[PDB]
From a paper:
It has three catalytic subunits: cytochrome b, cytochrome c1, and the Rieske iron-sulfur protein, which are responsible for proton translocation through the membrane and electron transfer to cytochrome c via the redox reaction of ubiquinone in the Q cycle.
We co-crystallized bovine cytochrome bc1 with three antimalarial 4(1H)-quinolones, CK-2-67, RKA066, and WDH-1U-4, to investigate the binding modes of these inhibitors within the Qi site of representatives of 2-aryl and 3-aryl quinolone. X-ray crystallographic structures were obtained of bovine cytochrome bc1 co-crystallized with CK-2-67, RKA066, and WDH-1U-4 in the resolution range of 3.3–3.5 Å. No additional electron density was found within the Qo site near heme bL, establishing binding of these inhibitors unambiguously to the Qi site only, though the trifluoromethoxy phenyl sidechain of CK-2-67 and WDH-1U-4 was partially visible in the refined 2Fo-Fc electron density. For all three analogues, the 4(1H)-quinolone head group is placed in the hydrophilic region between His201 and Asp228 and forms edge-to-face aromatic interaction with Phe220. The bis-aryl sidechain in the 4(1H)-quinolone analogues extends away from head group into hydrophobic cavity between Phe18, Gly38, Ile39, and Ile42 residues, and the trifluoromethoxy group is positioned between Met190 and Met194. The additional hydrogen bonds between the quinolone core to His201 and Ser35 make CK-2-67 and RKA066 a more potent inhibitor of bovine bc1. Amongst all the compounds tested, CK-2-67 and RKA066 has the strongest bovine bc1 inhibition at 0.1 µM (90% and 81%, respectively) compared to WDH-1U-4 (7%).
Author numbering:
A (entry chain G): 2 to 75
B (entry chain C): 1 to 379
C (entry chain B): 22 to 229, 235 to 439
D (entry chain A): 2 to 446
E (entry chain I): 33 to 78
F (entry chain E): 1 to 196
G (entry chain J): 2 to 60
H (entry chain F): 11 to 109
Write the structure that this text describes.
């Protein structure tokens, strides 16, 4: 399927500016920084937990392997 | 007409596949990986061909020819390290690519997806035989262990293994044939990848919302031609950062002492991108059992679509699933770690647990998660 | 400079005012309108009108287009029921290039099978576009309803005939209708001497029924919420004195808007109808006049449900004109309107060419505007009441289009 | 007895002025009929957002009675002398005029004066013409040409008074009080903003006199504080895309910024525009047509119709094309059209420019035929240029243009410049702005 | 020479009438004419 | 009405050059394009730089390696070949002959009837220093090694098909079509010859 | 006088042919400038360490 | 009943409402959904088209609506149910008939 | 000739982390060298010491070269 | 089998953009020459490789001339022995592995060409091994010639502490302390295993700079093209 035969759409206007009339980075840090933070909060409690858990299973297991390879005092 | 772009039998195809192709407005950076995989493939082929202009597959000369490349051939080093880090970048790009597919439910495009599974398997076969060609310790010993696993197969197993080998051990024939297969396969990958897109372009792309996008399509040019250039640029930065500042980081030292059928290296292990499945093999104590688990640890991908339960396509709007998925990722990162460790405490247990968690997540937890979510929407 | 005039022995008229303008209009007028089609070749003249710019003996189809365009020129072909008009315009220095083209198109078209075949679909397009104006449905219908022959002929080729007008019919039609005895060659911005000489050398071509009024009705049911409707009786023929009576009666009753967005406070009909019914509507006296015949009446446009009321209201207004209610102030208005209209219509060098050539066929020669205004003045209040009288008692023809569920039949009126 | 010559002895235009500053202009011939009226520098460009479409509102009220002739007296009187009374509003120019017997020129000019100056604007007549505009606004909604052009302006001159439609937003039509109308009128209808123009059989002297007789009360007193001046209008490279797949055919209108009324480049542009030309499916031409856009569109049924335009405003304009085509053809129309702009820009031929010349010569000579076109040419020229340009002057500027000029001039406006695009209807195919914009240059030049 | 006043697209939905002020000027008054051209859009007149 | 549509405010998004609604964008059109195309143009110069280097390297790889270059040349101490003696060396896996020619042989090759030669190549056209003739020990017929101080011309004799060469290395007798090959060489001093 | 970016545009970047000639010239200069200037940065960072630096002691 | 606690929670966590999407906008289109959509009236189709267009454009920008604009849990009418239910009920019937 | 290495090994040895680790060394020194019939040895304690010593040695030795 | 990993010594080439100290390599070369060449081999480095790195062309020629190497045959069919050229590699101590074991009590000395690359820890590791030789801990009896090194796997190595103070005089007269001798030889063994090191890092800096240019440029090109869509406002205006 080619542009022209994709789907049926009715009563939607779209206004847009030429790239040469506008700037590449409107409000880049002003708006950027808060939007990143919003985005970060929204997923952190879904993304981060498992990697925390990896960190723990990993650091526990590593030094358990080191400890177990030392001689036992008995 | 006059748009040769649309007219010419050859240009028509490019126009339809790279220029006027309706792409969704909203595809994320996770969609860059297809393009990047393509580049990885070309990259391997160029560097590969240039390495093959100087290498020899005779067991006696093989290691030396590779060092000869890195010492005496002009820029042979940057070519070789590029090819080896390029293989890494290939797998990173692959795993992100497949990850995208899982999270966003792209695998609903079944032919596209399965062809993906074939592509994955083939790049694995390619990269397995590639690491042998230098003929260092880890090359040789890694190759002996893995290949040998096939011997687990009742009856024929033991014959089949010596048939791959062309002898009673990984020796001359093995390398010479591994050179040939390694050379021809990328080309077959090229073909299958074109079939991959051949199917893709029948539906066009999924997008992060998972919701059909024909109400807001944009032509690939210029939007995605520009993004791909940017993507590729970031790919080349990753590659070259490895190649020029840490070329040895991702490989193994033992692959700098020549292959010696006597001296067995301390902990033989394949390259990092196999370590997850290496660990899964080592979970299961029985050898044929561990072969079938390593087999299932990859082929399970072709099962994923059947296991799909959500009424929603993407995980975007699906919190439980998101979590279980990120679990599954981290679990894979744990299997990678565990696979690189000696078979000892506490790694044996961690591994066993991780391998159980892997199949459990794919076969049981994530399908359930789907249905709960549903019931919670009164789906 | 004023107008010159010639009628060669072969019957052909040349008329031409050299006015030394920067632009030159030449028109070849021919008694080859739709009326000269018979029941066998209906629609031929319509294809013939689309068919200029098709290869000729002296110029290719490519050359006609490219050549005329090169010089900023224009070639047009206009048809009524009775004539066809081939007109060329151009900067004055290129009249003889356009004249070459005009001659080729009209005296020597080749009508090649492949070209003629190729062009058939244009009949559908042309007609299709044209019939988007509902007035075109009703007028074409009206004529069909009112006449048994000739003037009944639609200008646009009937559907069944599209794809079926043959090369031979086109040849036959030109050969038998495009003749010296049937043609008047009119001109602005050109010397009469050399028009005459062109007409003698290039337009010397050897020559080759009465329209019976019937009275019927025809009704297109189509479900628009507006109903177009026209009611007419037989009027007098063009060229007769009585015809001037009709023109005046038309302008008494009301025949078109004078002020934009206006209420037409002097239009007798408009007011007659506006008193009965308030929602969107329009009405005009309709006046056609041909060589054999004429139709006079009125055209309404009404809401579907009020079509009954509007047509009756309009007809009633004519009845009181025919009974006798008609003051001089009204007939003075009407004459002034008509007089002003005529002069204005011939104000452009375009409308002028149409009048000169138009008269040249239907009458002996050019009647100056001054004589014509005098002839409008020549209409007595008596003649106007007769025109209306004739209409009320005359056998009726009717045509409607729309949702006709409240449109009355003739016998219902 | 040549063309060059014919131009030389075309009647000159008489130019005169009243105390208040009303200009009086006249072109005369032996003619039983005439046209005369008032052209005014007034329209939507002069309106703010709060009184938008006042000028249009007035147009409805203009012919609806005066103090001297209340109600239908004005109507009746025009009718009964066989005169034709007419009006129009653009974004820059209002115009009311009358087509009359040459003999009735006096009453003609009296009546015009009665309309302008002593316009009734009755309470109930306003409230009646209120509904009428609303319904006109509605019919206009079903004209795709109308809509697309309104949109081209709206996006082209966005955030200015030129973005404004003549008719005004319905909100205004519903709310405009009689107070707003009378205020608009006194501010904009002033003698130095106005021109009385006439053509036909009339001694100029008589017109000037008559001007005095009836237009003497016209004020020319803009206090220093409130002198209507037209701030330039910023054009923006932009797109407005009203997608309504329910309609049968797509309207696209695309323009670059033009130079506006004053500039001589307008002449060379007109030549170039005539090369590319205009088309529709009713044309005899087909493949053999001279313009490649036309022949290609015809042979391959790309569009149903198209025209190039070059609309001029004060110090800006819209130079482009509008086409109406199948929902599958928008890409191919846009590609050949833009193709054509580039070919003229880079590589115009002499013969084809000669054609353009000849077209434009022909165009504006045969346009000025009969009194109404000529009357209007006078009226508007006086507002736009400050004078009627003789035909022989037009011809001198036309002879001046060669291939080299057409290239240079077209390059100035078209080549690598941001267009404004409006599309309406099933425009799903209508190319992306970036693609349209990249279509304004050749990577071969 | 000049383009026509209202261009002609076939298959293109009709322009509406919603008042008396647009209607007047529509009621037919003289018989039909049809012009076709080389340049100018083809039209139909009273 | 559609006339109720007004275009949203783009001020937030606009370049400052085009913020002023009452001024012409045409000022800044020259400029705004300039800035944007500069980015494009700059970028291309950057990528040119890279692609040059990448291509340049890959092409380099296929050019001779350091080890092939290291058997490129040969250093022969001239003061170790006494007058009259033909010393052979190993070069490009080929025997390479370096002969100290006596006062006698110099005069004899200079006087040689050149139009009798199957392959002309005058002596002084085959040497840099007349007391030294450097030739590849490869017979031009079928690739054998000619033996020093044998044959009819007191130069070389190849036993394979009977090739006789003079002290300039020229073919005078037998089937060999060409004179023995003159290598590229130079003298780096009075003692040293670098062949290669 | 219009601005510097504007000067660059009308002189170098409007015609695509000049745009390309610019790129190749600028690249030639960029190349040497960047090579020379970056090499400086490397060699200063590794003062005295490089064979180029300790060359002189054995010649 | 008592699980309505979780539902309202899940709804907000799921978060499609932040794009002004209603639940049925998110339904993955199989053949049943396609038919159900195909059977929607003008009003309901055009709204769906819009809400998705809106949402997709938001997705691209990596933003959300203002909280006022978010689909309120309670105001989420289940627009596709009636059509979809019957599309399915119909298919199940012809499936039965094929035995 | 003084080796800078054996200088620094001394310098580093007098830090709390080191001195505590060599005490660990000496406890088992005279635990295994006092006891008999005990296959247990004391590398682990030497390595504890060397790890902490040589970490410090590294931080400072290259200064002298 | 506990393990003590080496500490991370602040080498002259540890950092991103830090080259090898070539004067250090020239010394370190000599520490291979006078000390290990007897026991260890280094097959991938030839006399030529030193040129432009630690030795002039002419110096490297002299170093080459100083050694015997077999060549042949001559036409008689004999293998002779001759002076080394630049094109000869650093020559092996023994004729084969089996012979090398005989000489060192069963242990085969590894080739040193890639030793920095082929041992986890690299120059940190080798340096710790060379300087980390110590007396056994109490409780410990190593076997015959199995000396005690805390950094070797299994803690017992079959290599005598090869370096000690003044085990050679350096060409440039650096005080040959054990630590200095180990530092230098490691610097050379780095270069042995990775001759590209310096060139590579040059390329690193030029790549970081080019990417520094191109990444934000191309990012801006992207945002430019994309700004058409980013800016756009939508309106649903149903009848
Ligand atoms: C086609 C497509 C792409 C896309 C894929 C690859 C590349 C770079 C590349 C790789 C291999 C090539 O070899 C070939 F084809 F020439 F033989 C050539 C080029 C660039 C782009 N990317 C997409 C991203 C999002 C959505 C769709 C696509 C897509 O269809």
């Amino acid at each position: 399927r080619q542009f022209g035969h994709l789907t049926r759409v009715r009563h939607v206007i779209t206004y847009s500016l030429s790239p040469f009339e506008q700037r590449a980075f409107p409000h880049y840090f002003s708006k950027g920084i808060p939007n990143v933070l919003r985005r970060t909060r929204a997923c952190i409690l879904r993304v981060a937990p498992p990697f925390v858990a990896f960190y723990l299973v990993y650091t526990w297991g590593t030094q358990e392997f080191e400890k177990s390879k030392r001689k036992n005092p008995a | 007409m006059t748009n040769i772009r649309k007219s010419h039998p050859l240009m028509k195809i490019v126009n339809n596949a790279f220029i006027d192709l309706p792409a969704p407005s909203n595809i994320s950076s996770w969609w860059n990986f297809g393009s990047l995989l393509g580049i990885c493939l070309i990259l391997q082929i160029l560097t590969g061909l240039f390495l093959a202009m100087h290498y020899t597959s005779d067991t006696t000369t093989a290691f030396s020819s590779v060092t000869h490349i890195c010492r005496d051939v002009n820029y042979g080093w940057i070519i070789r390290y590029m090819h080896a880090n390029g293989a890494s970048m290939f797998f990173i790009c692959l795993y992100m690519h497949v990850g995208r597919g899982l999270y966003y439910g792209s695998y609903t495009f079944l032919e596209t997806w399965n062809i993906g599974v074939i592509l994955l398997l083939t790049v694995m076969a390619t990269a397995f035989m590639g690491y042998v060609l230098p003929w260092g310790q880890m090359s040789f010993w890694g190759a002996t262990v893995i290949t040998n696993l096939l011997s687990a197969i009742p009856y024929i197993g033991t014959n089949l293994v010596e048939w791959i080998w062309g002898g009673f051990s990984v020796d001359k024939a093995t390398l010479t044939r591994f050179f040939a297969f390694h050379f021809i396969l990328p080309f077959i990958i090229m073909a299958i990848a074109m079939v991959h897109l051949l199917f893709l372009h029948e539906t066009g792309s999924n997008n992060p919302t998972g919701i059909s996008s024909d109400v807001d399509k944009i032509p690939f040019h210029p939007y995605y031609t520009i993004k791909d250039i940017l993507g590729a640029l970031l790919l080349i930065l990753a590659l070259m950062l490895l190649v020029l500042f840490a070329p040895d980081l991702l490989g193994d030292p033992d692959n700098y002492t020549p292959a010696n059928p006597l001296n067995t290296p301390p902990h033989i292990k394949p390259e990092w991108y196999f370590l997850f499945a290496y660990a899964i093999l080592r979970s299961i104590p029985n050898k044929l059992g561990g072969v079938l688990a390593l087999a299932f640890s990859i082929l399970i991908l072709a099962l994923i679509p059947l296991l799909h339960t959500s009424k929603q396509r993407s995980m975007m709007f699906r919190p439980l699933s998101q979590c279980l998925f990120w679990a599954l990722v981290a679990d894979l990162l744990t299997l990678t770690w565990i696979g690189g460790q000696p078979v000892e405490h506490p790694y044996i247990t961690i591994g066993q647990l991780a391998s159980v968690l892997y199949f459990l997540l794919i076969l049981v937890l994530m399908p359930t998660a789907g249905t709960i979510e549903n019931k919670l929407l009164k789906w | 400079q004023d107008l010159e005039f010639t009628r060669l022995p072969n019957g052909l008229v040349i008329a031409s005012l050299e006015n030394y303008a920067p632009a030159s209009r030449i028109g070849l007028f021919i008694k080859a309108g739709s009326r000269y089609e018979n029941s066998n070749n209906l629609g031929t003249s319509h294809l013939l009108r689309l068919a200029s710019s098709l290869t000729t003996k002296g110029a290719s189809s490519f050359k006609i287009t490219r050549g005329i365009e090169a010089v900023g020129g224009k070639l047009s072909v206009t048809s009524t029921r009775e004539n066809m008009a081939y007109t060329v315009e151009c900067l004055r220095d290129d009249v003889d290039i356009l004249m070459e083209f005009l001659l080729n198109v009209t005296t020597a078209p080749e009508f090649r099978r492949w070209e003629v075949a190729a062009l058939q679909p244009q009949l559908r397009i042309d007609k299709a576009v044209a019939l988007q104006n509902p007035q075109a449905h009703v007028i074409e219908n009206l004529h069909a309803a009112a006449y048994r022959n000739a003037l009944a002929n639609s200008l646009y080729c009937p559907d069944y005939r599209i794809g079926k007008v043959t090369p031979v019919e086109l040849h036959d039609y030109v050969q038998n209708h495009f003749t010296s005895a049937r043609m008047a060659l009119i001109g602005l911005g050109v010397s009469h001497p050399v028009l005459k000489q062109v007409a003698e050398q290039f337009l010397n071509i050897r020559g080759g029924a009465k329209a019976k009024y019937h009275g019927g009705e025809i009704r297109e049911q189509n479900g628009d919420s507006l109903v177009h409707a026209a009611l007419v009786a037989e009027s007098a023929a063009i060229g007769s004195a009585e015809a001037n009576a009709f023109s005046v009666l038309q302008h008494v009753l009301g025949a078109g808007p004078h002020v934009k967005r206006g209420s037409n406070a002097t239009s007798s009909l408009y007011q007659a109808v506006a008193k009965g019914v308030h929602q969107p509507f329009d009405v005009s006296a309709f006046n056609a006049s041909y060589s054999d015949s004429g139709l006079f009446g009125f055209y309404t446009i009404s809401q579907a449900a009020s079509a009954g009321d509007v047509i009756k209201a309009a007809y009633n207004q004519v009845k009181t004109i025919a009974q006798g209610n008609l003051s001089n102030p009204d007939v003075q208005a009407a004459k002034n309107k008509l007089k002003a209209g005529y002069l204005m219509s011939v104000e452009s060098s375009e409308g002028f060419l149409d009048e000169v050539g138009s008269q040249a066929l239907a009458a002996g020669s050019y009647t100056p505007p001054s004589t014509v205004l005098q002839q409008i003045d020549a209409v007595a209040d008596a003649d106007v009441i007769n025109a209306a009288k004739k209409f009320v008692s005359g056998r009726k023809s009717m045509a409607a289009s729309g949702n006709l569920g409240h449109t009355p039949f003739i016998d219902e009126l | 007895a040549t063309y060059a010559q014919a131009l030389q002895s075309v009647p000159e235009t008489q130019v005169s002025q009243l105390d208040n500053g009303l200009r009086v202009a006249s072109e005369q011939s032996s003619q039983p009929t005439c046209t005369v009226g008032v052209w005014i520098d007034a329209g939507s460009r002069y309106e703010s957002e709060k009184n938008n479409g006042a000028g249009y509102f007035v147009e409805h009220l203009a012919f609806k009675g005066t103090k001297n002739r209340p109600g239908n007296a004005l109507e009746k009187e025009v009718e009964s002398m066989g005169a034709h009374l007419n009006a129009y509003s653009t974004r820059e120019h209002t115009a009311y005029y009358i087509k009359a017997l040459s003999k009735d020129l006096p009453k003609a000019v009296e009546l015009l004066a009665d309309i302008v100056q002593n316009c009734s604007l009755e309470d109930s007549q306003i409230e009646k013409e209120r509904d009428v505009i609303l319904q006109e606004l509605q019919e206009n909604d079903t004209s795709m040409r109308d809509v697309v052009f309104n949109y081209l302006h709206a996006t082209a001159f966005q955030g200015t008074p030129l973005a404004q439609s003549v008719e005004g937003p319905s909100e205004n039509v519903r709310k405009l009080s009689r107070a707003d109308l009378t205020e608009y009128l006194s501010r904009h209808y002033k003698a130095p903003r106005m021109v009385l123009a006439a053509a036909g059989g009339l001694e100029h002297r008589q017109l000037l006199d008559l001007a005095q007789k009836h237009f003497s009360g016209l004020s020319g007193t803009y206090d220093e504080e409130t002198v209507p001046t037209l701030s330039p209008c910023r054009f923006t490279g932009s797109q407005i895309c009203h997608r309504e797949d329910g309609l049968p055919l797509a309207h696209v209108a695309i323009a670059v910024e033009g130079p506006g009324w004053a500039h001589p480049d307008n002449v060379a542009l007109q030549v170039a525009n005539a090369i590319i030309g205009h088309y529709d499916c009713t044309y005899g031409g087909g493949a053999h047509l001279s313009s490649p856009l036309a022949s290609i569109a015809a042979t391959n049924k790309l569009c149903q119709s198209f025209q190039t335009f070059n609309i001029c405003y004060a110090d800006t304009g819209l130079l482009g094309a509008h086409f109406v085509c199948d929902h599958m053809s928008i890409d191919d129309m846009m590609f050949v059209l833009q193709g054509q702009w580039m070919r003229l820009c880079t590589s115009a031929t002499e013969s084809e420019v000669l054609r353009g010349k000849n077209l434009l010569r022909n165009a504006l000579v045969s346009h000025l035929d009969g009194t109404t076109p000529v009357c209007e040419d006078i009226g508007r020229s006086l507002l736009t240029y400050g004078r009627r340009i003789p035909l022989a002057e037009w011809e001198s500027r036309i002879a001046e243009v060669d291939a080299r000029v057409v290239r240079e001039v077209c390059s100035k406006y078209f080549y690598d410049q941001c267009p404004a695009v409006a599309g309406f209807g099933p425009i799903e195919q209508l190319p992306d702005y970036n693609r349209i914009r990249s279509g304004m240059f050749w990577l071969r030049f | 020479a000049v383009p026509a006043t209202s261009e002609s697209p076939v298959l293109d939905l009709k322009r509406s009438v919603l008042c008396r002020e647009s209607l007047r000027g529509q009621a037919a008054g003289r018989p039909l004419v049809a012009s076709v051209s080389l340049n100018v859009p083809a039209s139909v007149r009273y | 009405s559609h006339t109720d549509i007004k275009v949203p405010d783009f001020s937030d998004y606009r370049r400052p050059e085009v913020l002023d609604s009452t001024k012409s964008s045409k000022e800044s059109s020259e400029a705004r394009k300039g800035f944007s195309y500069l980015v494009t143009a700059t970028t291309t110069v950057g990528v040119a730089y890279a692609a040059k280097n990448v291509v340049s390297q890959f092409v380099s790889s296929m050019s001779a390696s350091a080890d092939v270059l290291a058997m490129s040349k040969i250093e022969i101490k001239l003061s170790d070949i006494p007058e009259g003696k033909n010393m052979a060396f190993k070069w490009r896996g080929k025997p390479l002959f370096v002969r100290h020619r006596t006062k006698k042989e110099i005069d004899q090759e200079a006087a040689v009837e050149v139009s009798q030669l199957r392959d002309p190549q005058h002596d002084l056209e085959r040497v840099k220093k007349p007391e030294w003739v450097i030739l590849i020990g490869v017979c031009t017929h079928l690739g054998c090694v000619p033996i020093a101080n044998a044959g009819d011309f007191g130069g070389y004799y190849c036993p394979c098909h009977g090739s006789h060469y003079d002290a300039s290395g020229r073919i005078r007798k037998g089937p060999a079509p060409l004179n023995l090959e003159v290598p590229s060489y130079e003298f780096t001093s009075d003692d040293m010859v670098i062949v290669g | 006088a219009p601005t510097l970016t504007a000067r660059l545009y009308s002189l170098l970047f409007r015609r695509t042919s000049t745009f390309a000639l610019t790129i190749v010239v600028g690249a030639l200069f960029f190349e040497r400038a960047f090579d020379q200037g970056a090499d400086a940065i490397y060699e200063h960072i590794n003062e005295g360490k490089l064979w180029k630096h300790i060359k002189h002691k054995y010649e | 009943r008592w699980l309505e606690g979780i539902r309202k929670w899940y709804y907000n966590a799921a978060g499609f409402n932040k794009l002004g999407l209603m639940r049925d906008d998110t339904i993955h289109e199989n053949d049943d959904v396609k038919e159900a959509i195909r059977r929607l009236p003008e009003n309901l189709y055009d709204d769906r088209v819009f809400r998705i267009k809106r949402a997709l454009d938001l997705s691209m920008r990596q933003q959300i609506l203002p909280k006022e604009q978010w689909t309120k849990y309670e105001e989420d009418k289940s627009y596709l149910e009636p059509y979809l239910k019957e599309v399915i009920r119909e298919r199940k019937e012809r499936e039965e008939w094929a035995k | 000739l003084v080796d800078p290495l054996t200088t620094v090994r001394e310098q580093c040895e007098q830090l709390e982390k080191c001195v505590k680790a060599r005490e660990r060394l000496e406890l088992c020194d005279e635990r295994v060298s006092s006891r008999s019939q005990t296959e247990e040895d004391c590398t682990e304690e030497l390595l504890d010491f060397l790890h902490a010593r040589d970490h410090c040695v590294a931080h400072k030795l290259f200064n002298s070269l | 089998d506990l393990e003590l990993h080496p500490p991370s010594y602040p080498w002259s080439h540890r950092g991103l953009l830090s080259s090898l100290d070539h004067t250090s390599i020239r010394r370190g070369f000599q520490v291979y020459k006078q000390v290990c060449s007897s026991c260890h081999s280094m097959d991938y480095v030839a006399y030529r490789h030193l040129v432009g790195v630690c030795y002039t062309e002419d110096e490297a020629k002299a170093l080459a001339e100083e050694v015997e190497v077999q060549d042949g045959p001559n036409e008689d069919g004999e293998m002779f022995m001759r002076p080394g050229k630049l094109s000869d590699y650093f020559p092996k101590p023994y004729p084969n592995p089996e012979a090398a074991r005989a000489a060192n009590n069963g242990a085969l000395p590894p080739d040193l060409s890639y030793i920095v690359r082929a041992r986890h820890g690299g120059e940190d590791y080798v340096f710790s091994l060379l300087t980390g030789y110590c007396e056994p801990p109490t409780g410990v009896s190593l076997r015959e010639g199995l000396y005690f090194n805390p950094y070797f796997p299994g803690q017992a190595i079959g290599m005598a502490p090869p370096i000690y103070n003044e085990v050679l005089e350096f060409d440039d007269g650096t005080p040959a302390t054990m630590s200095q001798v180990a530092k230098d030889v490691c610097t050379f063994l780095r270069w042995a295993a990775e001759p590209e090191h310096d060139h590579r890092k040059r390329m690193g800096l030029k790549m970081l700079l080019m990417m520094g240019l191109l990444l934000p440029l191309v990012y801006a090109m992207k945002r430019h093209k994309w700004s058409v869509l980013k800016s756009r406002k939508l309106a649903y205006r149903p009848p």
